[PDB]
Amino acid sequence: ADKELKFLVVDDFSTMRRIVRNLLKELGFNNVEEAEDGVDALNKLQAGGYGFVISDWNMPNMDGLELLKTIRADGAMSALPVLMVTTEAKKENIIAAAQAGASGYVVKPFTAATLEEKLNKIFEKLGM
């Protein structure tokens, strides 16, 4: 995929954001911003330029399922790739996110290999 693709990495905790940012760097993606919750995310996203979202689930202000739903419901960004990255591992949570239009779903904790496989699975699916 184009190494200029702009990423938004959303999570209410630094540690996770820093892990993902660094991993993206390792893969050749340096165009990366962070947000701390769904509201913060939608703000940056509305400032334009984003090609990919990676999002936590449990966050104050707006959780990741609500964020995903909002993104899918906005006509300007309804096809933005959204990859969930969360501790929520119950099948009902996976179903709910999938049905809400998640592009992919990784369960924390994850390996570097897992994140790369899943990002690539999404690239291939969307012909990126």
Give me the helix-helix angle, 38-46 and 64-73, nearest 10°: 30
- Region of 47 (left: φ > 0; alpha: ψ -120 to 50; beta: rest) is alpha
Q: Which one, of 50, 52, 3, lies nearest residue 25 by Cα?
A: 3
Binding of ligand BEF by 108 (CB under 6 A): yes
Nearer to Mn ion, 1 or 105 (CB): 105
Is residue 58 within the footprint of ligand BEF (CB under 6 A)?
yes
- Binding status of residue 86 toward ligand BEF by CB under 6 A: yes
Distance CA 128, CA 5 (A): 10
30/17 Cα distance (integer angstroms)? 14
Q: Select 14 or 61, whichever has its Cβ closest to Mn ion.
A: 14
Q: Which of Mn ion, ligand BEF, none binds 14 (CB below 5-8 Å, type-dependent)?
A: Mn ion
Nearest distance from C-beta of residue 108 to ligand BEF, angstroms: 5
Contact 85, 20 (CB under 8 A): yes
Residue 57 binds ligand BEF (CB under 6 A): yes
State the amino acid at position 22 in one-letter form.
N
Site string for Mn ion, 49-88 (x = CB under 5 A): -------x-x------------------------------
Measured from the CB atom, the residue of 14 and 43 that comes closer to Mn ion is 14
